[PDB]
Symmetry: C3
Subunit: 162 residues, 3 copies
Amino acid sequence: SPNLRYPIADVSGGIGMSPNYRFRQSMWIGIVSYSGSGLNWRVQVNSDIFIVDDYIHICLPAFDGFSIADGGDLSLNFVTGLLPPLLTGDTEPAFHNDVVTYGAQTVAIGLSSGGTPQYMSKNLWVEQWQDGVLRLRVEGGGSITHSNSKWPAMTVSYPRSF
Amino acid sequence: SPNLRYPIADVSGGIGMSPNYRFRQSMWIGIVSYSGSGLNWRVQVNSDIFIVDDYIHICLPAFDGFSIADGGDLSLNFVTGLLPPLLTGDTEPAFHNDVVTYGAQTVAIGLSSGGTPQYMSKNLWVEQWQDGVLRLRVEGGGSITHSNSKWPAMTVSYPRSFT
Amino acid sequence: PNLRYPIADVSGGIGMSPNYRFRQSMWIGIVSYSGSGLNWRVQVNSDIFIVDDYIHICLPAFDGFSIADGGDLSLNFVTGLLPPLLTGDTEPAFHNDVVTYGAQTVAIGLSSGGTPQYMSKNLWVEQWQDGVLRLRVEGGGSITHSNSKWPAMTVSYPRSFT
Ligand SMILES: [Mg+2]
């Protein structure tokens, strides 16, 4: 109705909440890039996206990468790979390009040289979204000599811009 | 207020947001079951449930189980044990019975055989809800030889169905 | 119409208050540990995000002293909140109930000035009382140590609306 404003909407002939606001599902098939202490690699991932109320959730699957540093960045390039009609701008946080420490959590990453991984307890958080790239910080928990990393499934969530 | 549709509701004579939508508390007294690589066991938990906006949160307490595999499933049976007037259908995700990797997190589980536990950081996620049973994947982090598992308190959350 | 927050006038129609959807603040305050006769405090500068019916407290990494196998981490919201946020704004929707909310893994580095050993502890929101939020931190075993390296931790819970 012309006298209602999204997320408020006509719901079977009355005043309700837009179903689209309550739950929207999408997908990202795209590139995750790691950078830290001169180490750089990238990997393609298939990830569900769920937008629920004023939050976005990016459900990353387990993946394998190469060497990581004590501290580093994991970057999700949303500039391509989003399933239409979801656009890059739809992934911008409500704090826009502010630098933050949002949703900080433990992530166990298995470091190896081909053999039995040693799992390190690292600290991950959403740090910054900039020009359609979501940057996550991954640091702490110490490290070992390794050439491969086994990354767990990780859900990345934050407040979405409206 | 025939013109209104939940979660929009009459609030002190005007148009507001239903308090029931904003916060609801409940309880599940029920059975958590583990299955992985031919290992099966179950325990009872008494767990708070919070429904807040379009999310449901299941606050599992710490519990003790037996042997686990490198990878396996932890299943919560919502068919029984929900506090009235909550029903089994109330726990269906907004992605219904789709197979997902939602709310993936680290859980540290203490593995022992009567002595001091070794804590394994494993990877847990909501995988699938089917006919009132919520299936959580628990994998990764390696393992040791063990007969007993000490599970931490874990909160499991996901967007909740509304039609 | 007679609108009731968070329903509010938006651009001439009935919509959702932007304030309900996203609010960003800060808490510059004192975090106190207590367990088994151990007591210490630190200063934190932390972002607060209020999004829909949730509050998120984004604690930065900090260093403290000895911890017990089980103990309490307490956030003093009586002071330090950035105006116009007030202490009452941090009350959970379960008010002063004792709960086990948002239980998660937290890896904490225990040392005596040398290389930390990281212990996977279990943290949850336990109770808010008179402007003090009590978090429980237990499990994962322990070692003899004089210092603790705490990771960045985000603490979230449903927020009271009165
Ligand atoms: Mg106590």
